[PDB]
Each structure stands twice: as C-alpha cells, then as structure tokens.
Design an enzyme around this catalytic site. Structure first.
Site, short mmCIF file in Angstrom:
data_model
loop_
_atom_site.label_atom_id
_atom_site.label_comp_id
_atom_site.label_asym_id
_atom_site.label_seq_id
_atom_site.Cartn_x
_atom_site.Cartn_y
_atom_site.Cartn_z
N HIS A 39 -7.43 -7.75 3.37
CA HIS A 39 -6.75 -7.10 2.36
C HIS A 39 -5.30 -7.30 2.58
CE1 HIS A 39 -6.65 -3.09 3.99
NE2 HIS A 39 -5.46 -2.93 3.28
N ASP A 75 -13.11 -6.57 7.54
CA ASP A 75 -11.58 -6.62 6.96
C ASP A 75 -10.87 -7.30 8.14
OD1 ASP A 75 -9.58 -6.43 5.19
OD2 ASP A 75 -9.76 -4.38 4.62
N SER A 128 -2.83 -0.52 7.57
CA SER A 128 -3.63 -1.66 7.58
C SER A 128 -3.37 -2.72 8.66
CB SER A 128 -4.05 -2.06 6.40
OG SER A 128 -4.81 -1.12 5.57
N1 LIG Z 1 -9.24 -2.73 0.22
C1 LIG Z 1 -8.96 -1.99 1.14
O1 LIG Z 1 -9.68 -1.35 2.11
C2 LIG Z 1 -7.55 -1.26 0.98
C3 LIG Z 1 -7.51 0.09 1.67
N2 LIG Z 1 -8.44 1.15 0.78
C4 LIG Z 1 -5.95 0.70 2.17
O2 LIG Z 1 -5.48 0.84 1.04
N3 LIG Z 1 -5.77 0.69 3.46
C5 LIG Z 1 -4.56 1.05 3.67
C6 LIG Z 1 -4.46 2.16 4.92
C7 LIG Z 1 -4.88 3.44 4.74
C8 LIG Z 1 -5.91 4.15 5.70
C9 LIG Z 1 -6.32 5.43 5.56
C10 LIG Z 1 -5.58 6.13 4.40
O3 LIG Z 1 -6.14 7.33 4.23
C11 LIG Z 1 -4.94 5.77 3.56
C12 LIG Z 1 -4.46 4.21 3.58
C13 LIG Z 1 -3.52 0.05 3.70
O4 LIG Z 1 -3.56 -0.78 3.10
O5 LIG Z 1 -2.42 0.03 4.67
#
Ligand SMILES: NC(=O)C[C@H](N)C(=O)N[C@@H](Cc1ccc(O)cc1)C(=O)O
Ligand SMILES: NC(=O)C[C@H](N)C(=O)N[C@@H](Cc1ccc(O)cc1)C(=O)O
Lengths: 697, 697
Positions: free
Chosen positions: B62, B200, B633
C-alpha cells in the site's frame, strides 16, 4: 457429538454418553415419561420443559414471541416492555393455538405402515391414499381417550414409522418475559452469531379444566400438575463439562440427493433471502408510520428476518465446506458401492434414478409457484382459501376429509382466524399482495400462465396490479365476526358471495385441488423409491464407520457433548460470554439498548451470588458441540446429573450449513446460562414470585 | 509497550527493552547511522529499510501503490497483475517525486529556535514570519552539500526543536509488487481488521549518479550502496517473542486539548467520513463505466477508503474507551495540580486560556472551507491555482518565498504536474467538481458566502452547478504539455488567459492570499502558550507515573513489545494467521480472489520450507503490542537480534482511537511475516532474483 439420536438408539450412545461425562445411568434416560425426560415438552415448532409442580414451563423468548405479540398493543408493547404475572390470575392467554404436548407413548408401527403401502400395489395415488388412511386410522384409535393428540412419524425416508401419543394441553398462559432488549439483545445483528449476549428465555404455565382434562381458556381452569419437572443446576457449569439436550428438531436434509441440495443452494435459498429482505423493508417502513402495523406484523418480521439471515449463512457455509463437492462425491461413492453389489444393488440403483427424475419437474414453474403461493398465503386471500376449502371438506365423511380439515382440526382453524385479528392490517396486507403480484407480472409471458390470476389481473403492468388490489380491498374478511361466520357456512354460501377474496378462492380452488392430486401422485412415487435409496446411503455410511441417525422430522431426539469453543484462522472463540460483554456492546440504540437496571448492575458488579469464579463474572451464553436445529429452540440443556444449566436457542454462523452437511469443527449450539436467567429475574426485570416457585430464593 | 520513543530516550527504555527480551545492547540502537538503525529509511509518508548492499529497499504494497499506479494502464494493469524486474534495466521509475531519505545526523537546536520567536516582539504575524525565516535559513545551511535534505522538527509542543540531516535519493525504481489480490487481499473489507491475511509488501531500488551524488531518473544511474542493511530472520518468530519497530510515525494527538478532540469527535471525522464515502461511490460507479478512470483514480480511491474507515474506527474506539471522559478528567486534573502549584502555576494556566480562546473561530465556516478547499484541490482547478501561485512567487526572492514554492521545491512541483498525467480524467474531475459544488449550494444562505463561487454559479441549484462544471470543462490544463508551459510562464500570461480554470485561479487568489495571512496570524498566538501548557501535562503525567513521550511529528521513533493476541468477551484473537486462513477467505470475487498458484500451493501444502511447527503452517500476519500510527507502514519489525521478521502495515479495529487516547488492552500492530514474503516470492508470484539478492534461495 454428531447425531440427533432417537430414544430407541440410546443403547448405541450409552457408552459415548458415559465417556463424555453423563452421571445418570443411560437407562434413566430411556424412561421418556420418567425423571428427567418426562419434563421435556413439545410446543409445536419449539421445545420447552416443566420447571415446577404447578405447571411452570420455560422456553426461549423467541419461542414465546408470538404469545407476547398477541398480548401487545402499540401503547402497551410487551415485546418491548416485557411482562410479569405476580399471581395466577395475572397470567395472559398465549392464544387459542398455543399448545403444550406431554409425551405419553411411542409405538413402532413400521410393519403395519409398510403393509398398508404395499397393499396399494403399483398405483402411486392409491399408495399415497393408503398411507393417509393408515395415518388417520392409527391417530383416530390413539385419540379416542379425551385430551390426547397423536401423530404418525416417518423416519429414514420411510424405513421406520412410529406413532407418538401426547397429552395436548390447550390453555397455555404467559407468566414472564424479560424486556425485548434482554430477550432479543443484539436483534438481527447478533442473530446466528457468537459471541452472543442474549437473555433468550420466557415462562408459560400449562392449565387444564377443573375435571383435569385439557380445555380451551376458561376462568375456572387450574394449573396442570406435571409428574416430573427439571431442577435448576446447583453445580456451576464450566468449560469441558458434559451437557445434553432433549427436544424436537424440525427438519434436517443430510440424506438429500446431490440434486436436491443443488436446487436449494442455487434457487430456493438465494431467492427466498432476496424477496424476504425486500418484504421486511416494506414492513419496517409501514411500522415507522403506524406502531399498530409494527406490533401486528412483529412475529412475521422476526420469523422472516431469522429465515433470510439463516439462508445467507447456509450459502456461506456451503462454500466454506464445499458442500456441492461433498454431496457429489458421496452420491458417486454410494452409486458405485451399489454397482459392486450385483443384482442385490439394482432396486436401490433404480430408486435413485426415479428420485433423480423427480427433480427436473420443479424448473421453469418454480418462480411462478413461489409468487402465486406467496400471494395466496397473504392474509385475506389465505383466509378465503382456507374457509372455502373447509366448506368443501365438511360435506364429506370425517375419515375422507383432507388432513388439516378433519373434526380434530376445527379448533386450530378457528384459532387461526381469531389470532389473525392481532396480526392483520388491511394497508399492510395490500402492500404484500402488491409485492407478490408485481413479481408475478414481471415474469416472462410463458411463465406467468396462472389462468385465474391472469383473468383477475387483466394486464401485466403496475396499473393491473393496483386494479386487482383495489378490487380485493372490498373484502369483508378483515372482520373477525365475518371470518367466524364463514367458518360455519356451507359451500353454496361461498359460491354465492360477492366478497371479492371469497370469489377469488372459489375461482382458484379447482386448480388448487388438481395441483394437490399431482403432489399426492409424486408422494406415492417417493413412498417406494425414497426408502430404498436412503437405506442404501445408510448401509454405505455404516460400511464407512460413519454415524447413522435419521434426519430430524419434528420428533423427540437426544444430542450430547461438552461445553467448548471453536476457532477460525487467527481466532479462538471461548465457551462463555459474561455480563461485561453485554455492557461493552451498549450503544443506547435498538438492538443494543439494555435496560438501565442491567447497565447499573454490571457497572457495580452486582453479581447477586451467581458469579462463576472461573470466569470472574456471571455467565450469559455458552457454546457446546451439540447437534441441534430449528425446533430445538427452548430445549433444556441438562448437565451430568440431569439438572437444568441453560436453554438451547441458536447456533454460530458456521453451524447453519450442517442442515445439509454436518461439520464437527465449527458446529456449536449457543445456549443461555440458567445463571443469567436467574440474574435477570433478580437484578434487572424482577420476578420474585417466579424465583420462589423455582426454589431459587 | 506504550510510547513512540525518540532515540534520546533509549536510556529510559533500555531496561524495558531487555525485560521484553532484546539481545542487542541498547547502546547499539543509539547509533542511528549504525547496524541496524542506519538500514531504516523515510519515504515521506511511509517507512522502509535497506535489505541488500545494492540499495534494495523493502516497504508495504500500500506504500508502493502510488508507484505501481503511475506505471499502470487499463491494458497493462500492475495493480491487478503485479510486477517483477528480473534485471536492473527492467526496473520501472517509481515517479519523479518518489524519494528515499537516509539519516545522516540529529542536532538539538532548542535554544536558537526559542530565540527566533522571543526576539520577534510579541506580535502574532511577526512570530509566524520569524520562526519560518529561522527554519528556512537553518535548512539552507544544512543542505549546503549537493545531495542532502534537512528539516526542523517541533517536539512536545515546542519544548524541543531538532534538525534532521538526510541524504535525499531522487531515483527510486519499482523492483517487485505481488498481485493486488495478494498485496491488498481483503481490500477495504479487511482494512483495519484482524484476522488479517495480507502479503503487504513490495520492493524498491535506490539509484544515484556514477559520481555517488543522488540524481533524478537517468538511464545511466547506478544502484546506491548503503553502509547498513537488514538481514531476514533465520530464527522462527513465535508467540511471546520480543519485537521492535523503528520508523517515522506522522501525527498523534495524545497531548491535544479536550476541545481539539471534541471538535474532531463531533465534526471533523464524522463530516470527512460522510463526504469521502459519497465521493468514493462516485469514483467507484464512474470507474465501472470507464476502465481508464478506475486505474487513474485508484491511488486517491485507496487513500480516501483508508481515511474514511479509519475515522469510523476512531469514533467507535472513542465510545469504547470513553475518550471524551478521560480527556476532561485529564484537562481538569492538570488545571487543579497547577492551581495547587500557586506561583509556578500561573504561566501554564494563562497559556491554557490563550489556547481555549483559539478553538471556536472555525464554527460557522468549516462546512464552507471544507467544500471549497476540496473543490479548489480538484485536479484541473488545483493545478491552475498552484501554477499561478508559483508565477506570483517566482518574481519574489528566495528565503522570503513561501516554503513549498521555494527553489528546493521546484522539482517536487513539476513532479505533481507530470504525475497528474496518470491520475486525470475530464468526466471524473467534472463529477468530482459537481459533488463538492452540489455540497456548497446545499448550505444555508448566511454560510453560502464565497463572493467568487456564487458569482461563477449565478444561482444555487444542480442547474447553476452543471452550468459552471460545463463552463470549466472548456479548460485545456487537462494536457501535461499545457501544465508544463504554465509551470515556467511569468504571471501576466496567466491574467491574459481565456482558460476558464486559469481565470478561476486568478479570480479566487486574492481571497486565498487574505485567508492564508489570517491562517499565519492564528499560528503566531499559539507559539508561546502550547509549549507552556503541554509541559505542565507532561509533568502532571510524570507525577502520576505515566509513560512520557512526544506526539508523532514525522521524525524517527522506536517502539517495542512482544508478539501477542488480544481479546474481548467470548473471543481470543491468536497472534498469527496462516496459509489455510487465506484459502478459507477465497470467494473468487474481488477482494477475496487469490492467485490460482496460491490456492493450488495451499491445497497441496507446498510450504516451501517456511512452516512454523508451532502453527502447523506458514504464518501470514501477526499481532504485537507495539505503538505505531500512519507513517509506520513499511517499518521493519526486528527480532531480539535486530533481524527482519516482518513489516508493520496496519492496526486492529480497536487500535485506531489510540491516535488520541492510548489503550494498551486492544492496541495491536498487524505485521506481514518475513516467511510469508519469502513464500510468496518462492511459490506464488515468483522473484528468484530478489530471493538470490536477499540470500534466501
Ligand atoms: N491498506 C492498509 O492496510 C493501510 C493501513 N490501514 C494503514 O493506514 N497503515 C498505516 C499504519 C498504521 C498502523 C496502525 C495504526 O493504528 C494506524 C496506522 C500507514 O499507512 O502507515
Ligand atoms: N432469534 C434467534 O436466536 C432464533 C435462532 N436463530 C433460531 O432460529 N433458533 C432455532 C434453533 C437452531 C439452533 C441451531 C441451529 O444451527 C439452527 C437452529 C429455533 O428457533 O428453534
């Protein structure tokens, strides 16, 4: 454990019962009129049990729902508020068609039934008529003593027949219902799901006449005094504990042909789910405009919600376990094991060919038959058809009347006409008539070929549907006094009526009787083929070391196992929910709107002497690997010493496909803990007179 | 463990780190340019890590989604199909604006920073101008050498400032993306959820010029040679094992005022979630009519889906934990412990009152600004605005030119205009304009006060809207060649133009300039209060014995904990998913449609030497009690030995409200297991070249 075991199979499960942790002697369970099996009762579609010597009966909230609905108004909504009767005189009639069935006798009549069927020779209609005549004669002799009702059951595709004799209690009264926010906590969101937090219980009392015999509701009737009743468990139910259920599961299809499964999966389930969801939206909208519509249709709305969600669940389950593939593989294995059997395997092989041939018939008609069937079972139109049909059967000798229209059925037909007064709103029925006609006229011309309905519509557009519904709106059958007059009328009075619904019933009846004759012909063809094929599947199952027990058929079955959770990848579902789980689901909006007294008691940890120290709270619901289905709602769950630890009420999402293909890994019963029933009646929706009657305080 | 700990707090957490099971020494972590912390890089909005001496970079799918999307077409769709570069020359440019940042050093600039505000007088608009001019120049001095990017970071309110020096790699190429069915398995159904079965991951490669300077895409650029890279773990990761994450969390708000929260809870998240869901149905529906629109809007659609579902999760989490209550319980207890301080109290208390006063200003405008701001950041209009704003800023000198329109930003701007080429459709952008205008002309009269927009609409209905969207259609900024022409134009050229969108750009700009001056005033007032109040909170928390650590601000942070599940009533989430859980989710329909090679390899138990015996399968995702947020992420998950055991990618549903109020019970990180990454590149969407370069096969 897998299996809905008949009482006659107790010798086969005695070892497994003991191994699972039963501490009663299996011989104690064989006495079906003794302690504790004789406390278990049928309600017709639901199970219940006696829990006092004064005829107190416990069942599920969702089983008493109809009785609660019949006693509800928009101003005094018992479904919402709940109900308690502090004294016998406060108890409300559950309605003229409420029953408690107390088992008296089971008789094996296999040889006599098979002899009646064979005596018909090769004519399929004569075969169907012979079994009908045999059924009526058995039931007439068994019902000669006042207060008994008998039923013939067919097991294992017609390989076994047993006659049940029951005392038929006809004066059932509502004693207690928790509020709907407890009885139905989480509504259709949590229906068919774990984790579950639902207080699904309610209490009736059985009455008899002052002479001791069953009677309709009367002021001088008195509580029934049962021989045996269940006691609430003193031992705390924990993980791994033995539990068993006795009750009346309705229908399973585990012995279905692969093509019977394929038709249900590809047509019946998705089609009913689609239309029921659309009708429910129409009823929900009408209910928001007029709370009387909401109350009058509430039982219908709950039933339809439960069926639609169940069907969506079965479709997901079939894909989960590849039910289509398992059916195809088993049917291929049976047909190959027969071939290897020589001449001996030829009759079963030919029975299979005959049943396979029966499937094709119900394609190209099946959407028409659904829409026209649903239209004809709308309220005014269905009352008209029933009433006209009864006037025709009345002119024949009682033994020659259609099953459902004999002298022994008259009070049930009358009861249905009475109960309709609490379940009918003309403006709602008009919308239901419009909905099913709209589906019918949207069919292709070749398929919308119901000649009487085509004459009455005189069109195939919205204007034609509106026109027929406008005409049928002139009916007087919305009036209870009118229905009760028609119930007594001869067939000529129906044929002279200018009441439009009556005219319609008179118009369609000739084609309805012809369709009945075709059904009876197909029935007679199955009476020889189905038993031969189903016996071969059972023999094959036995050769493969698999469990052999009959599909559910509304008769008394035993299931057993242990308290335990289940899992999916990355999840383990634990065997109990607790009070803190109810409060954690609170939103203050239906259906997660618990009573304030419950939220207050959970916040204070008022556990009222019922805390299970192993859980650190009062248990609410629990899981176990028992084998139940529709009809088992309200079944008492007994522990190792035959004491009541809860009521069966639901299954988990992954369980519902077990109707067709049993899965031991993800099939669980969801039961309400007797400790939560006590906690609600102590801390939340008080029933002090009931806790005293149960010897619980 | 709670805390996004800055590297300077390694003394504080060195004990917990070892008690948790860290085998490395905490001294070894303090060395940010060393092994393994030097292998950790920022992508600006995502974290990543070097995994090879040839500048091989690993992040989430992502995170690489924008890169895959820029290199995709309705005919050659790398989102759906995935991608592999067997050789260096097959690697596709990730985009002009794609970056890798390698940390060079951190220097504390607190004293110098507080001077630049202090010696600005006490006027608001001067302090805005003051800090900016101090930041601008402190960054210019830091970016002396050709290939570095620097950034000033405001911590704990302004009680700490730090300067980050990074080497800026400007040539990032895509090496490998699994299929969208693997990289985004479960899509927006499974987003923010456990159980999770998402591979991912994706790989970049960092390129420099042959001299060793970073440079823009040139076909003769060479792979960067990092000083440190991470090794994949050989020790199998199990339940209870130590894990740590290093990375660049964006923004948390655990130090905000109760009113900042209550505004977010009561307006911002519900409004944005509502309007984003509507905008997403538009893009969805349009994308189904045009297979070209789908590819071009896929990045904004994924982003907005992610934010909309996140905000719904936060709102539910606020209710679960009583976020409102805990905040007012803190914002009231701080003000009491300061009124109990007497003399030392008064600066904090006055500071609180100054911020309190800045809250209500937006109340009557938010619905307007949001709809307008959104309309103006539409593509055609958004391009037109920013170009004209640059043509305005060009004629000024540097160091006085607004940050983002400076010399060092010019490359990033052109980037945008180029990238727009793969993200633009007329009838989609019109549909988008149509929506945000339709929302504007829905407002009451007193709030519908955009001089220019009401002017350009001449009316306030769907006809007036359709009027202006069909006016703006006349633009030619839909052409890249057009966009790049205007990039370098002067200003007077813009003002002469008869392009409806340049004309709109010109018309609105004075009102945009005004509103940004006011914007800058507003910030000024804050720059003295905020540090004062947040320091009191920090000490109030310190006094209570609560973990003290600054809110995320896009800088480097360490979090640690252990592999562990979580629970709620009736359910225990286990710390790992497995291959069988992926298979079990298969529906053949998006987004549950795995590669046939995955389903075949699973069915056949092709585990490829990666099974964990403790699970009886290859693990897919795992849970741990780390503290991560947006920006984390792609962060490497390191075991006890500083080896890579996975990549951070998500949180469970209950974790998301921890952006305001941390909850240690139900906050878990979801990470993709390094053995699932390997397994995918061995058995499913092969990458033998990467397996070799990583030293795995
Ligand atoms: N498609 C996804 O899985 C995107 C994911 N929901 C996301 O937004 N991940 C973020 C990391 C994150 C981890 C844990 C919490 O509580 C919030 C955000 C990111 O893109 O950095
Ligand atoms: N509201 C309810 O909980 C009704 C429930 N879903 C239901 O239909 N219960 C039936 C019992 C049953 C248990 C287990 C399985 O798998 C099927 C059905 C019933 O009403 O008898």
């Amino acid at each position: 454990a897998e299996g809905m075991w008949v009482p006659q199979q107790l010798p086969e499960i005695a070892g497994p019962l003991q191994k699972a942790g039963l501490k009663l002697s299996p011989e104690q369970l064989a006495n079906l009129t003794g302690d504790p099996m004789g406390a278990v009762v049928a309600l017709g579609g639901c199970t219940a049990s006696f829990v006092s010597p004064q005829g107190l009966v416990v069942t599920n909230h969702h089983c008493a729902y109809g009785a609660i609905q019949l006693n509800s108004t928009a101003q005094k909504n018992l479904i919402k508020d709940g109900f308690n009767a502090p004294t016998l005189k406060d108890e409300l009639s559950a309605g003229p068609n409420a029953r408690v069935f107390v088992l008296d006798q089971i008789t094996d009549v296999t040889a006599q039934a098979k002899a009646a069927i064979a005596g018909a020779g090769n004519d399929p209609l004569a075969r169907s008529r012979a079994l009908d005549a045999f059924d009526k004669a058995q039931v007439a002799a068994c019902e000669a003593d006042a207060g008994f009702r008998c039923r013939l059951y067919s097991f294992s595709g017609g390989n076994t027949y047993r006659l049940f004799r029951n005392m038929e209690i006809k004066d059932v009264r509502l004693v207690y219902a928790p509020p709907g926010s407890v009885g139905k906590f989480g509504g259709d969101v949590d229906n068919w799901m774990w984790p579950r937090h639902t207080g699904d219980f309610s209490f009736y009392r059985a009455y008899v006449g002052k002479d001791g015999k069953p009677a309709a509701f009367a002021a001088d009737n008195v509580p029934y005094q049962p021989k045996h009743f269940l006691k609430f468990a003193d031992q705390p139910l924990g993980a791994d504990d033995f539990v068993m259920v006795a009750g009346y599961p309705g229908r399973t299809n585990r012995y279905a042909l692969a093509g019977e499964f394929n038709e249900t999966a590809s047509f019946t389930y998705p089609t009913i789910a689609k239309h029921y969801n659309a009708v429910l939206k129409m009823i929900a909208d009408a209910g928001k405009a007029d709370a009387d519509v909401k109350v009058k249709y509430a039982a219908t709305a709950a039933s339809m919600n439960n069926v639609a969600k169940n069907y969506l669940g079965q479709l997901e389950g079939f894909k989960r376990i590849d039910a289509a593939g398992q059916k195809q593989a088993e049917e291929a294995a049976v047909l190959a094991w027969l071939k290897k059997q020589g001449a001996a395997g030829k009759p079963a092989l030919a029975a299979h060919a005959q049943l396979l041939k029966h499937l094709d018939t119900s394609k190209s008609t099946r959407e028409r038959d659904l829409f026209v069937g649903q239209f004809n079972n709308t309220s005014a139109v269905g009352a008209a058809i029933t009433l006209y049909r009864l006037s025709i059967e009345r002119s024949k000798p009682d033994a020659e009347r259609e099953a459902g229209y004999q002298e022994r059925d008259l009070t049930t037909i009358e009861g249905g006409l009475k109960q309709m007064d609490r379940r009918y709103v003309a403006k709602m029925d008009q919308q239901l008539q419009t909905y099913w006609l709209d589906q019918y006229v949207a069919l292709p011309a070749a398929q919308r070929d119901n000649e009487v309905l085509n004459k009455w519509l005189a069109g195939s557009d919205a204007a034609a549907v509106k026109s027929l519904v406008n005409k049928l709106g002139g009916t007087e059958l919305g009036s209870l006094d009118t229905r009760l007059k028609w119930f007594k009328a001869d067939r000529a009075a129906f044929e002279a009526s200018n009441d439009p619904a009556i005219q319609y019933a008179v118009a369609v009846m000739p084609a309805l009787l012809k369709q009945e004759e075709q059904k009876k012909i197909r029935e007679g063809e199955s009476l020889t083929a189905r038993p031969l094929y189903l016996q071969a599947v059972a023999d094959y199952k036995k050769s493969q070391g698999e469990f052999v027990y009959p599909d559910a058929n509304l008769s008394l079955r035993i299931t057993f196992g242990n308290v335990m959770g289940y899992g999916k990848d990355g999840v383990k579902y634990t065997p109990f929910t607790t009070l803190e789980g109810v409060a954690a689901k609170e939103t203050g909006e239906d259906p997660f709107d618990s009573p304030k007294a419950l939220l207050d008691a959970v916040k204070a940890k008022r556990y009222g002497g019922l805390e299970d120290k192993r859980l650190g709270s009062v248990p609410v619901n629990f899981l176990s690997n028992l084998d139940i289905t529709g009809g088992n709602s309200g079944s008492p769950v007994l522990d190792a010493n035959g004491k009541l630890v809860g009521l069966a009420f639901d299954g988990n999402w992954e369980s519902v496909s077990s109707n067709w293909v049993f899965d031991p890994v993800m099939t669980r019963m969801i039961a309400v803990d007797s400790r939560y029933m006590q906690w609600i009646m102590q801390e939340v929706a008080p029933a002090p007179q009931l806790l005293k009657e149960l010897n619980l305080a």
